[model samples]
Structure formats: structure tokens, C-alpha cells
Target: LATLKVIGVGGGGNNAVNRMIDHGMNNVEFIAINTDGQALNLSKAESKIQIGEKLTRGLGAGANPEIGKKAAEESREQIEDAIQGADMVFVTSGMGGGTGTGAAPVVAKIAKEMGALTVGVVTRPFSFEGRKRQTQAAAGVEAMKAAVDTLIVIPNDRLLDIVDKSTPMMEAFKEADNVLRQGVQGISDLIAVGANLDFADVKTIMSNQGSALMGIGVSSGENRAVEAAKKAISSPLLETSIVGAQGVLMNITGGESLSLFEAQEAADIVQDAADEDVNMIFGTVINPELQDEIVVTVIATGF
Candidate 1:
């Protein structure tokens, strides 16, 4: 078993940590770190750290990235304690302003320094959020490139393709976080021995991969297999191509009604999308509730 540590930082990351709290996966540790005390008070992760408690006074860094960075510096010792020794670490957050934008890179940098395969799953701000925010996110990403081994960038605007606009704006934020939420479980599932993709495969894919993409698609029809894979591969939020990706990990879920040929059909589509020598790995799982639907999940690194 691999010792995987997941640390959610900032307000957005703390929210994600609340969702992944008490997840029943084996050999996984979850921690939540935030700049706001009140917000940190609500996170469900067993281990929680309030960064820069004095600097932010639990009020948060607001839109100041430098303050956020200073907070991370002030709390580096505690963050390192939270990390401990781990084979791999995932630093998840939302990028735009304050803590997430400024501190996430520092957190990921810490994880890497601890000699762990550090992965970062972050969502960029929506266009409507304004140019300043977009610029902040851009700077955050550039800073992240210096630390995160595999950075999975999910553009917030793409959420509309999967969620109906009828969804209230506040609810849309949660929808966006679900992308990172799913990526968390998806990675755990893919690397567990029961699945086809192993930790080695994921590690290899991210060995030097600076960019990554993640997506999931569900369908039920005569051509569900191929259709689902296509949808998963063409996720709107992660429009990056995988033509020559270093590696791809896919998980196919279906009910007992699923057939080998159907799995092959779905597999063939993604197989054709990458290079012939690409390190493509995949697996299948059966869910009694998915009687007529097939859900395909894909994660490509080194793109």
C-alpha cells in the first residue's frame, strides 16, 4: 500500500477537505489548512491547521497574495508537521485571490521538498470574475510550475457544459469543486491494486509532467461505450490535448450488463487518441446501480 497524503489549503481547499473528510480509503491521510479561523473551524478533516493565525487574525488574507505567502511562511513548520513522511502528496485548491493563489504554490513546494510526488489539482477563476482575478490565477499557475510535479488545471468556465445554468451561482462553486473531489477518489481508485493502473504508472506519468487533465463522462445507449470515452476525453474544462501524453489512466464503470466488447470499444477510442507507445492503463468496475449507464473517467499527464 502507498502512503498518500492529501492536503487541502485555503478557503476553497478547506471546503474540498470537508468533503473528503473521513473518506474510507485505505492508507490515505487527509488534512485541511486555511487562513481563516472561522472557516477552519468548520472543516471536517481530522487534522486542520490555520496558517498565519496572527498575520490574518483568522480573518483571511483577502485579495493579497503577499499576505498569503507570508502566512505560509509563518506556518511552514506546522505545515511540514502535517505532511510528515508520505510517498505522494496532493495539494488541492482554487486559484484567483488571497490564500489559494499565493499559498497553494508554497504548500506544493513544501510537499515536493519533503521528497514526495506532489500533485496539485486547482481550478481557475471564471471569466466573469474579472481581469484582475484571471491575472492572479495566471501568476499563481506560473508559480505552481516551479513546484507541483503534475498540475491538473480545470478552468472554471467549463463547468457550464456539465451543469445546467439553472443551477444557482452559489451552487455552481460546489459543482466546480466536485471536479477536484472526483479527481481525488478517481486517483485513489486507479492506483489501488484492484484497478489496472498502479501507483508506478501514475508516478511515471507525472515523473516530469508539469501539466495534466482530468475528466469524467457518463452515457447510456447503443453506443454508450465509445460515446462515454469521447465525452471524458473532451472535457470542456480541460481542453488540453493528449496527443502525445506521457501516460493516461482510465477507469470504466458499468453494471453487470456491461460486456467485454463494450469495454474494448471504449478503450479503443482513447487508445487511438494518444501515441502508439503512450503509457496507457485502464480498468473496469461494476456498480449495481449503474444498470444502463457507463461512466468513463480519464486522467492524462505529461501533455
Candidate 2:
């Protein structure tokens, strides 16, 4: 029932944090780590970890090896503490700079080491932002995905489809926030539903004992494909297949309240993609921005 919010910012976790608050989410802790030039005067977690001087060289790969070492040590302390009291920790950041680049991985690793279910909610720069940031964002993402328990990848490039075409940078950022909020809230609602299936129910699946992958996509069809996708989250194996992503840990994040049957239907579709017998199914209800578009995500395990 505890949610810890960790914001990774080279410039500011403030924007991301502000968006989460604007969306009406509660009962969560917030913390911002602003290193390099990303100044976050505001944060969420009860504590703040700052990796100031270290971010200037970019991520952790800097000419000054000492800076990386200092940032790592500072990051470990705060992140470890946050993870200790958290059930699930969400790491958010607009990467491509210093703090977010250097600190995000550190925090996620600490969360995992502390036994918290760790999930990274990250933002990738829009393709137009130029390749320098894009390259850094890519590296940051790789570092985060490899370490966290679950990752909700938000592509800045893909966000144009989610917001008004003419929306300004600020407005677009707000729109992106709405999308992110629904995502976290969707998962939160599912975990809190007191349903027969909960995040805890999928602990076995998370252990990665068998093959586990989550795939998700948007489907506007009310046909067999969508229904099949619904079954993916409810079935015993708790895995499904959707539009994008291969070897995904399939979970549906939409707003509609789903019944057990509906959940099972989604799982079945995911089962179609299974290469081996699966472990568990988990899902969250979300009101997708694309109306009539049934967005699906599948997580498949086993090599």
C-alpha cells in the first residue's frame, strides 16, 4: 500500500512531480535528485539526494572518474533509504543530462537491493531534441531497464500522438503528465482492487523463474483480438500479447473496470504468444487516450 516516488532530473524532477500532483494522485512519497544543471527546487520523497558537481560531464561516463564515484556513493544512500520503506518505487526523470543520467540507475538498484518492487517511469526526449540528448537518453534507459523490476517506457517522440498537434512545449508536457498519471493510477487501482489477483499474486512471475515478458498495444477493435488481449491479464499464467513489445510482462493498463472474465479474455490472447508455459498474469485498468483503441501489453518469460 506504500508508493515511493523518485524523480531523476539532470535539470528538474519538479516538472514530472508537478504533473503527478496535477493528476490527483495521493498516498505516495516523493523525492527529487537533481544533478548537473537540472534544478528541482521541489521534490516528493521525504528525503532528497543531490549529485551536484558530478552531472556536468554527462551520465556516469565522464572524464573525471572521481565525480562518478562521488555521485554513486551519494545516490546509494538516499535510494537505499527510500526503497527500505517502499512496496513499489516509481523512478521518473527527463534524462539526457547529468543527475538523471547518473543517479537513476543508482536509485533503482538500491530499491531492488532493498527488496522493494521497483518500476521505472522514464521519459525519452523527442527525436527533434537532437541526437546528443537522444544518445544520452538511450544509454540512461538501458541502465535503468536492466536494473528495475518493471519499466513503463514513455517515448517523448511518440507523445505527439497523445497530445494536441499544436500544443506548446509546456502544454505538451502537461499532456504527457496526464498520460503518465493514468498509467501509474491504473496500476495503483489494480493493485488496490482487492481482486483475487494482485501484484503480490504475481510475485512468482516476477522471480523470472519461467519465461516472462510483457507486451502492450492499442486496439480499437471490439473483435476477437481485443477480447483475446483482455484474457491475457486474468488467466492463471497471467501473461498476454498485444501490439508492441516482444517478451513483455503483459499487463493491461486501461480505465474501464474489468471483470474477472474480461481479465481472463485478455490473458488468453497473451497465451497465444507464449513460447512456453507461463507463471502468472497481472493487469491494471486504464482509460486509454485513444478511444476504441484497446491498448494491450504482454510480458513473456523464459528464453
Candidate 3:
């Protein structure tokens, strides 16, 4: 089993990481990186670093990403330490703020340079944050696009369409965190000891895949595979279209009785939805306790 490292960057990133830790996934270690000393102290992760100790002196980056960038640079070695031995690194963040905008790409670059298969799952700013934040987020997303093998961006603007209008702000943020958590679990399942996929499959598919899209669906019993597949491809949150995605990776999990046919049907539905012939791959894993339930997770890239 590969040990997965989830490094949450900045305030939103820290809360996102803690949410996953609360959900509890086996073989996963969570780490939080932030500039605020007070908030960093409350991180639920076993390991966390108050970055740029000398630069900001724990005052935080405010809205200046340059400070965030400088802070990350000063604490680059510490960032390196958190992900050094990681089999796979997930740099989770929320872009727009100084810390998130400035630090995310730097953290991801360090992890990628260390030869780990690094994936970035980040959220763009919500509409209420103002236009300046949007521009800043665009630049940060562009920067991070170059830093990792694969980046799944869940834009908060588009994210609003799917959530119930009355949902509270913090809970809505958790919805984004849920997406990141699923990305971690979906990719991690690929390397499960008995699963059909392995690290090489993931590595090969992720390379140069560019900005990505993801969705997860769960159902049980009759019509499960097709329904799950449709749900996986139909999530409305992403700005990118599946039509341009050149690579599609799907991972299916079900009870011990899961059949090869069921998994095939699941992948087929997503494949059929693509606009062109794509480099498609999928794997099936078992969780004995799942019994009648089935989960389908999809990540499409190169869009």
C-alpha cells in the first residue's frame, strides 16, 4: 500500500485537510501549512509548519501574495521536509488569498521537484470575493498548472450552481473539501494492493494532462453502474468541458461480489461521453463491507 501525503496549504487548505482527517482514510497522513501562528496551532494534522517564521513573524500574508510567495521561499526547506518521503503528494489549497495564492504553487513545485507524483486540488475564489481576487486566482491557477503533473480546479463560482442555495458558508466550503478528499481517495485506490491499476498507470495518465475535472457517484443494486457513471460525468462545478479532456481515468469500488462486467459498464458510460477518442483507463477495487453499494470516481485531464 502506498502512503499518501495530503499537504493542505493556507487557511482554506488547513480546514480542508482537517475535514479529510476527520473523515479518516487509511494509509493517509495529513499535514497543514499556513502563515498564521494562532490558526496553525489549531490544525488537526499530526504535522504542520508555520511558514515564513522570519518573513511575516506570524502576522499572515493578508491580501499580498508576494508576501505569501516570499514566506514560502523562506520556509522552502520545511515544505520540502513534509513531502520528502511521500509516495504520492496532494497539494490541496484554496486560491485567492495571499497565503493560498502565493504558497500553493511553491509547495507544489517543491513536491514535484522531489520526484513525487504530485497532484493539485484547489478551489478558485467565490464571486463575493471581488474582481481583484478573481484575477489573482487566475494567475495562481496558471502558476500551479505548471507546477504539478495534474491539477483539478474546482472554481467556486461554478461550484455554487450545484449546492443548495440555502447552504451555510462554512458547509459550502466543506463541499469543496469533499471534492479534494474524493480525489485523494480515488487516486489512492488505484494503488490498492489487489486493484487492477497501479502507480505506473496513474503516473502515465497524469503526465502533461494539464487542468483536470473530477466527479464521484455512489449507488447500490440495480442500475448502479450506469447511474454512478452518469453522476460521475455530470457534475456541474467545473469550468472545463469533458469534450477537450484527452485522458480519462476512472476507479470503481464495490463489495467483494463486484463483477468485471459491472466495472466495464461503469467505465464505458464515461468513455462514451467523451467528444473524441481518449486515452482511457480504469480499475476496480473491493471493500468487503460495501455489500450492495458501488462508488465510481472519475478524473479527466488535458482539457
Candidate 4:
């Protein structure tokens, strides 16, 4: 079996980690790392790391990336211990701030050194947050590019389009967290043998992919297959087209009564959305509780 670990770095990451724990997963470990003791305390992760105790004194990095980097370096031993023996590590963070922006890349680097496949799911600050934060986030992404096999960047500004304008900010953020959780869960599900997509397939897909998109869609009806495929492909948060996609991994979960024709139809819709030459892989699982509902998860790379 393939072992997977998901690490949430900084305050924002910890929040995402907390939600993921609530959502639940199988054969996965959750870890939260932060410079603020209070923030770490609030996380539900089984393992927590409070970095740079001497330097930050349980306080945050105060939006300083340099300080964030220093804190991570100081707690190298603790961070290393958290990631040990994982086949793959998923690092989630919110960019443009100190702890997540600064320390995330360091964690990814360490994970790579430990011979684990590293994937980063980070959120960039909104445009209104100011140019300084945007620049910091850009630099952080640059640093992370070298450290991770696949880096998925979620632009905060896009949330406006993904959710209703009247939605509470916290609720909106929760939606974003759910998106990340679904993506991670989809990957975790792919690791199982037989009908599941293999780790080797995922590694191959990421080998040449620098940027990627992950989206989930759920539907319940006689036309669920086509509907879910359409929704997944047309995710507001996802890039407009899969025209240049070099690889795509699609996972589908449904009721036991799901038909072979339905599965093939769903795959056909997604395949038709991409360039004819694009490489595509798929996996499926049956959940008795699904009944009439179907969940489709799509991950496309080489944007």
C-alpha cells in the first residue's frame, strides 16, 4: 500500500488541515506546523509542530518570510520527524504570509530529500491584499517549484467567481478548504490497487507537469455521469480549457448499480474536452452509500 501524509503549514494551512481531518481520509496522516502555539493548539491534526520557539516565542512570523524560513530551519528535527516514512507528502499553505509562505518550501525540500513524492497545494493572496504580498507569494511559489514534483496554485481572487457574492468570508474560505480536501482525497483513493490508479501512474503524470488543476463534482440522477463530467470540467475555479493538458487523472465513485456504459460515457466527455494527443488515466470505486449519487474528481497537469 502507498502511504500518504498531508502537512498543513502556518495558520492558514492549519485551518485547511483541521477541515481535512473533519472530512476524514483513509491511509493518510495529517500534520500541522506553525510558529504560533495558539494556532497549533487549535489544530485537530494528530501531530503538531511549533517551530522557532526561541526565536518567535510562540508568536507568529509577523508576515515576514525571512523569519518564517528561519523558524523552519530551527525546527528541522521536529519537521523531519513529522514527514518520515511517507510515500507521498501533500503540503498545503496560504501564500503571501510569513509562516506558510516562508516555511512551506523548506518542508517540501525536506520531503523530497526523504525520497517522497511532494505535491504542494497553495493559495495566492487576493489582488486587493497589496502588491507586496503578491510579490512575496510569487517568490515563494518560485522557491517551491524546485522542491515539489507538482505545484497547484489556487488564486484567492478567483473565489469571487466560485462562490456567491453574499457568502460570508469564512464560509467562502471553508469552500476553498473543501476543494483542497477533495483533491487530496482523490489522490489518496488513486493509490489503492486493482481498479484504482497506481502511484506509478500519478508519478508519471507529474513528471513533466509544472502547473495543474484539480476539481470535484457530485451529481445524483439518471444523467449523473454526464452532469458530473460537465461540472467537473467547467469548475469555475479551474482554468478554462484543457487544450494543452499533457496528462489527466480522473477518479469516479458511484453506487454499486453504476453501469460500465455510464463510466465510459463520463470518461468520454472529459477526454473530448482535451487535446486528442493528451494522455489520460482513470480509476473507479463503488460506495454502497452513494446510492444514486456520483462523485467525480479530475486532476489535469502540464498546463
Would you estimate the TM-scores of all the predictions? Answer: 0.89, 0.68, 0.93, 0.93
CA lDDT, every prediction?
A: 0.81, 0.55, 0.84, 0.84
lDDT of 2 by residue, 1-303 (tens): 545454444443446666676565664666656553324444443455556344443333342323533575655655465557677776766666555665677777777777777666667677876777788777877777777776655666665665677767656566546545545544454565424445565454443232233333554455534554654443222223332233334456444544456556766666665544455455655553534545555544434
Give the C-alpha lDDT of model 2: 0.55
lDDT of 1 by residue, 28-70 (tens): 6888888988988888788888899899998998878888989
Estimate the Cα RMSD of every predicted model relative to the unseen true structure.
Answer: 2.5, 6.3, 1.8, 1.9
* Candidate 3 lDDT over residue span 170-243, tens digit each: 67786777777788778776666336776777888897577888878888869798888888888665455576
Rank all candidate structures by their TM-score, best first, as comma-separated numbers. Answer: 3, 4, 1, 2
What candidate 1 gets wrong by more than 4 Å, as runs, is: 21-27, 166-168, 221-223, 255-265, 285-292
Q: Count clashes in each candidate, considering only residues at least 3 apart in sequence or on different chains.
A: 0, 60, 0, 0
Angstrom error of the Cα, residue 255, model 3: value is 2.1
Q: Cα deviation of 296 in candidate 4 (Å)? A: 1.2
